[PDB]
Design a protein around this ligand. Structure first.
Ligand SMILES: Cc1nc2ccccc2n1CC(=O)N1CCC[C@H](C(N)=O)C1
Ligand SMILES: [Zn+2]
Length: 139
């Protein structure tokens, strides 16, 4: 689990969005596994606006933060699951690192702030859904 709280928005993995998230939907994208909903309280997370390829992510399955080198957001084939059929997820970044079902939601951060959240994994590789291009989250 996990979410990004910026201004009056909450960003979660689309496959984990709650009834409250859908009832207050701002934007969702199945191809990116992202959902954004509105909040009444103010969020203080800072979104990175950069092209960083290094950062640190939180891995709940190990209660530890790990420094990673990651790829530029792209279209990557993601194996079938109970939430989605086998498809190409867009705006996805891979890193060599630990993850397991339950780690989605952990934040990836660089020196500029929040880069994205855990969305995929397997084979000793962790995938992160990029959020840096969602310029509207700050305005
Ligand atoms: C996060 C993770 N690490 C894993 C390691 C090994 C095996 C599975 C692992 N998952 C879960 C996974 O990849 N899923 C399930 C939920 C929907 C995700 C999606 N964005 O399509 C795909
Ligand atoms: Zn950065």
């Amino acid at each position: 689990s996990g979410a990004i709280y910026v201004g009056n928005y909450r960003v979660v993995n689309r496959h984990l969005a709650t009834h409250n998230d859908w009832a207050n939907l701002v934007w969702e994208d199945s191809s990116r596994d992202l959902l954004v909903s509105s909040t009444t309280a103010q969020g203080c997370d800072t979104i990175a606006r950069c092209d960083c390829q290094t950062g640190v992510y939180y891995c709940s399955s190990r209660r530890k933060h790990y420094p990673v080198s990651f790829s530029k957001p792209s279209l990557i084939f993601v194996e079938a699951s109970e939430y989605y059929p086998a498809r190409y997820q867009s705006h996805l970044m891979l890193a060599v690192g630990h993850s397991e079902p339950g780690d989605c939601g952990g934040i990836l951060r660089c020196q500029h702030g929040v880069v994205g959240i855990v969305s995929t994994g397997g084979n000793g590789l962790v995938g992160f859904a990029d959020v840096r291009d969602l310029l509207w989250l700050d305005e």
